[PDB]
Amino acid sequence: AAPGKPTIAWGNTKFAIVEVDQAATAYNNLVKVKNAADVSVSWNLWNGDTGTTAKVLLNGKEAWSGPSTGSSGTANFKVNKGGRYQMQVALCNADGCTASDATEIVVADTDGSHLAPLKEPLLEKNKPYKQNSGKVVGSYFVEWGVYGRNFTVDKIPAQNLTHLLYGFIPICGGNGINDSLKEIEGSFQALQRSCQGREDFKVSIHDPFAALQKAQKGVTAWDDPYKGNFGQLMALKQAHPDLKILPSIGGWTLSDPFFFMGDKVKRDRFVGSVKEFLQTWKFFDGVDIAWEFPGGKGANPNLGSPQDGETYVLLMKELRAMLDQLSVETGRKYELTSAISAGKDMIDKVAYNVAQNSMDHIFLMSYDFYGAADLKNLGHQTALNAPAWKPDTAYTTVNGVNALLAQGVKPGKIVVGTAMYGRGWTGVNGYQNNIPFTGTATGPVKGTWENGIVDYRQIAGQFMSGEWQYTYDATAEAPYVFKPSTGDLITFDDARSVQAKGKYVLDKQLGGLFSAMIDADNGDILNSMNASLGNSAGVQ
Numbered sequence: 182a183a184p185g186k187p188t189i190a191w192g193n194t195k196f197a198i199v200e201v202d203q204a205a206t207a208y209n210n211l212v213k214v215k216n217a218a219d220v221s222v223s224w225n226l227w228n229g230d231t232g233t234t235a236k237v238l239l240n241g242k243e244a245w246s247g248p249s250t251g252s253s254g255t256a257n258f259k260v261n262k263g264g265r266y267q268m269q270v271a272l273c274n275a276d277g278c279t280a281s282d283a284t285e286i287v288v289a290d291t292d293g294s295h296l297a298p299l300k301e302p303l304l305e306k307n308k309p310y311k312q313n314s315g316k317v318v319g320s321y322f323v324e325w326g327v328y329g330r331n332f333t334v335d336k337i338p339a340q341n342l343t344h345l346l347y348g349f350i351p352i353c354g355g356n357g358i359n360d361s362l363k364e365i366e367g368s369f370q371a372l373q374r375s376c377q378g379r380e381d382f383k384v385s386i387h388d389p390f391a392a393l394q395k396a397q398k399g400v401t402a403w404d405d406p407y408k409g410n411f412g413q414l415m416a417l418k419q420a421h422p423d424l425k426i427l428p429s430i431g432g433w434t435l436s437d438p439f440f441f442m443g444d445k446v447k448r449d450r451f452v453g454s455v456k457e458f459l460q461t462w463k464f465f466d467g468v469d470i471a472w473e474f475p476g477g478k479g480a481n482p483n484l485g486s487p488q489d490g491e492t493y494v495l496l497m498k499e500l501r502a503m504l505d506q507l508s509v510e511t512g513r514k515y516e517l518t519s520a521i522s523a524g525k526d527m528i529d530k531v532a533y534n535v536a537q538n539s540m541d542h543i544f545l546m547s548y549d550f551y552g553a554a555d556l557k558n559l560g561h562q563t564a565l566n567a568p569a570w571k572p573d574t575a576y577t578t579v580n581g582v583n584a585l586l587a588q589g590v591k592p593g594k595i596v597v598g599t600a601m602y603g604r605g606w607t608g609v610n611g612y613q614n615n616i617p618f619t620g621t622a623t624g625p626v627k628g629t630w631e632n633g634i635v636d637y638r639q640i641a642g643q644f645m646s647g648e649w650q651y652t653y654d655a656t657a658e659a660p661y662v663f664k665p666s667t668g669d670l671i672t673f674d675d676a677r678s679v680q681a682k683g684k685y686v687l688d689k690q691l692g693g694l695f696s697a698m699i700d701a702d703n704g705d706i707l708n709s710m711n712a713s714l715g716n717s718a719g720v721q
């Protein structure tokens with residue numbers, strides 16, 4: 182007669198192709214990429230003949246076979262594709278095969294193939310839009326926003342984006358390489374710990390707890406291998422396979438290492454580490470280069486060289502070549518983008534007419550034009566045009582776009598930036614004709630999280646009532662609020678100024694809109710970005 186029906190033993194059923202060491206702070210030890218997951222199953226036979234061959238089936242297909250030598254057995258085998266499998270043990274002899282009931286096993290991989298889709302309802306004022314304009318709708322999500330700001334990946338209005346950028350991936354390096362980090366308490370030391378045993382100029386993860394280990398919605402079970410931002414982003418990819426999720430390398434305080442990549446030895450090491458990063462973290466769709474900035478004038482006053490423009494073009498070309506090779510190895514399309522200064526002086530340090538041939542999108546940082554770092558020259562921080570009281574204003578969105586177009590950049594490459602926050606001053610005084618910008622300030626406005634910067638959510642929630650004046654400058658296309666008693670003045674984007682940017686993008690056939698940072702919106706800004714670009718309301 183055929184063998185008795187085996188009973189699968191109680192045991193671990195969760196396995197991982199990319200393993201995460203739960204007691205490691207160094208990135209080199211934190212993650213172990215394998216070619217396949219090591220899977221184990223055991224069984225008992227409580228009634229009958231144990232057969233002569235035992236097999237482990239996954240969805241009916243044999244993954245392991247061996248002699249059946251007793252009433253209990255154990256099988257160890259490899260599974261090289263992530264997902265969920267109906268696993269059975271079968272005992273076979275000449276008279277037949279008898280299969281156990283199925284037990285589901287989970288084989289994790291960093292594409293999120295093991296995860297249920299993270300499809301969360303829209304929050305606050307966010308309304309559903311379909312991505313049918315063909316325009317970029319992008320936003321940056323910051324790794325540290327999960328702490329005080331409490332803004333996690335499940336709160337991203339993901340259906341209302343084409344591009345979600347993750348800020349920020351650091352480049353390893355200690356003294357002289359990441360000195361800008363020393364201005365943030367504990368941050369330099371955190372990077373050195375992540376990069377222990379890891380060569381300078383390879384990428385790493387700045388906050389592995391936030392990125393991979395903090396419990397979050399959908400990834401709370403202790404043996405879920407990927408938690409934190411990355412685990413949730415994997416599940417988000419399962420819900421939105423057309424969403425492009427890009428890691429952004431650099432930003433204000435992690436840009437110092439770019440200034441050394443004129444040395445091709447370092448540049449080659451960096452590019453190879455980016456390829457390895459994308460082979461490790463499969464939910465990412467490319468790379469964003471947020472080098473602030475070629476030529477200097479970023480966080481570090483001691484960095485910046487006339488060579489930087491050439492280094493930038495070489496970097497984009499070599500990144501594109503690496504991504505093209507990754508693309509044909511995987512069958513996937515990979516994107517290369519960059520966040521760049523919107524000032525004409527800065528733009529003309531780089532030959533974007535050449536670099537554009539390597540790049541899918543240029544994220545034009547048409548914001549932070551003015552702020553509390555200068556208390557004497559006040560202006561709109563993210564306006565489309567110059568205001569009427571100073572038509573020669575240098576730093577406007579249009580002047581940045583025009584600088585790119587004058588180089589020969591194709592307009593469809595250019596993604597215009599919107600601000601989900603205000604910048605502002607306190608004690609504004611000595612202004613003429615009821616225009617506070619013509620005065621001077623005594624300090625920064627009190628911020629939501631940092632001096633001089635206010636979340637748009639708080640502008641809308643607190644500074645659009647009481648004594649606060651509200652004015653929409655229709656020449657510049659820029660709103661501002663002013664508290665006369667204290668001289669508090671805040672410049673920001675609102676639904677109308679975003680609408681002007683979106684219409685301007687359509688009229689000039691630019692690439693779309695993007696924002697920083699997604700956590701600071703209440704929905705008004707992203708709603709207007711979508712509507713003004715012609716995205717249809719509703720869900721597709």
Ligand SMILES: CC(=O)N[C@@H]1[C@@H](O)[C@H](O[C@@H]2O[C@H](CO)[C@@H](O)[C@H](O)[C@H]2NC(C)=O)[C@@H](CO)O[C@H]1O
Pocket residue numbers: 433434522546548549554
């Ligand atoms: C061009 C641009 O994006 N804006 C610059 C600001 O980033 C910069 O302020 C700095 O902003 C960073 C985040 O973007 C912060 O991490 C950093 O603490 C902050 N540093 C400051 C306020 O000194 C300012 C600095 O003058 O320049 C803008 O142009």
